[PDB]
Amino acid sequence: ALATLKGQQNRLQAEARNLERQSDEQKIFMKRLNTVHNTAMNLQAQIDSIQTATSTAETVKAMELGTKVMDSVMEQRDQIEMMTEALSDPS
Amino acid sequence: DADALATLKGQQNRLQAEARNLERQSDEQKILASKMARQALKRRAVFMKRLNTVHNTAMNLQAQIDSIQTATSTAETVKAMELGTKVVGVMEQRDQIEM
Amino acid sequence: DQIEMMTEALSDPSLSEGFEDDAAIDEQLAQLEAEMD
Amino acid sequence: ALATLKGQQNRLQAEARNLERQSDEQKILASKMLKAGARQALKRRAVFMKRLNTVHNTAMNLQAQIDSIQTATSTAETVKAMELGTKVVG
Amino acid sequence: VMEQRDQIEMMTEALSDPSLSEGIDDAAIDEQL
Amino acid sequence: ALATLKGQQNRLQAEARNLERQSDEQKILASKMLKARQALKRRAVFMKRLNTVHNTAMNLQAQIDSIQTATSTAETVKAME
Amino acid sequence: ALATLKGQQNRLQAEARNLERQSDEQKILASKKRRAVFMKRLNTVHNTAMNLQAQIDSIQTATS
């Protein structure tokens, strides 16, 4: 489906080039060319968005699989610090 | 998890390539507007906002992966650190004698 | 849907950049100008 | 644990080095622009400066933590020796 | 998932105490100057 | 334990040497720039650290001296009394 | 034990001599308060040495 979507966008480009050639001939269709280009651009945006979402989903799923004493030390250090400071104290 | 990291880095490089594109087309839109103009202005403004968005994604993801690494390292080390500290867990007489 | 809910849930700002002082940047502008001045 | 502390220190130092280097380039950038460009360069280098300041503080904290481990061993030895002093003087 | 982030944040705030460090004279600065 | 304490004492001495070295660097910076308050604050912080480590080393040395003296004096003033 | 105490007092006189050197260093630096403080420290070390010598004499008496 993705490959055929790319091919159909290429077909939209072909129709657009044919339509601009026809418009040049008529000057010597613009609405049709505009809508063909809009179709191509919308499908391009769709494929870009889906690719971005798929890559984001894959990487975030991998990272989500990846992600899937204080009291004693503080008290002893504080009291010992106080006592040793009192020791050093020559006041 | 290493695969997650590599995939995130690859997607980030994809974002960077997209930003390089965006700035390129911004260049061509500026040139096209000068050669012409309002439509080129529209498209270059869209390009500029897209560039800002991709830059924001880049910076946010870099900060996020940095947080990942810092938190992982700190959490891993602290467990053993606190296990170690858990395993770890005359004054008057001198004064009198000198005098 | 579920994809969007994953995005919103895993934003985790506390994990990632979760204040500014215009006065500091202004005084640093002035300092740079004085240096050049 | 010690090895991962050393590795985190090396990572933190490399991140710092990148930060102040970047800040130097952005300082040159702000100087060369010097008003809106000056604002932008100052904002960017200020983000880098804040990053560098938290990095400096974090390095201080981790070094203090390692020193705290060593001093914890030291005070364990000291309290052992001063228990020995307790018993002998008693 | 979320609980991991919350607990790492709690541990960081608990261990980020300046009490590990100094944690606490301009006149003396001026005198030495 | 005695060897551990001796190694810790040597480590503290090296720490003090580095602290006085960086304090000297900061103070010479301050002198050059006065030829200032910010560098004075920095060197003062480093000076607080240096004198702190000096106190630690002095206390540890006096501590090992005190334990050896405690053994010896226990013996002696026991003999006297 | 007598030898151990003699070595300890020798260490005390070593401390006292280094303190004397440091006091002279302070004198010469001044010539070119801290000296008084370090002289007090020297007095502490000297007093420790003197007490150690006195108890050494007491040991010599008692053991003999």
Author numbering:
A (entry chain A): 17 to 44, 68 to 107, 124 to 146
B (entry chain F): 14 to 49, 58 to 110, 128 to 137
C (entry chain K): 133 to 150, 154 to 172
D (entry chain G): 17 to 50, 55 to 110
E (entry chain D): 128 to 151, 156 to 164
F (entry chain H): 17 to 51, 58 to 103
G (entry chain I): 17 to 48, 63 to 94
Task: Recite the paper's sentences.
Individual ESCRT-III proteins are small and have a simple set of α helices (α1 to α5) that define the functional core of the protein. The most stripped-down version of the ESCRT-III system is found in Asgard archaea, the closest prokaryotic relatives of eukaryotes, which have as few as two ESCRT-III homologs.
This interface includes an exposed region of continuous positive charge as well as hydrophobic residues, consistent with the binding of filaments to negatively charged membranes. While this interface differs from the reported interaction site of CHMP1B (A-type) with membranes, it is similar to the membrane binding interface of Snf7 (B-type) and CHMP2A-CHMP3 (A-type). An analysis of adjacent membrane-bound protofilaments revealed that interactions between them are mediated by their planar faces through the positive charges of helix α1 and negative charges of α4. A comparison with our off-membrane structure revealed a slightly smaller intersubunit distance in the membrane-bound protofilament (~3 nm versus 2.7 nm, respectively). The conformational differences between the membrane-bound and unbound polymers may be influenced by the distinct interactions therein, underscoring the adaptability of the ESCRT-IIIB protofilament. We show how protofilaments are able to adapt to different membrane curvatures, likely through the intrinsic flexibility of ESCRT-IIIB at the hinge between helices α3 and α4.
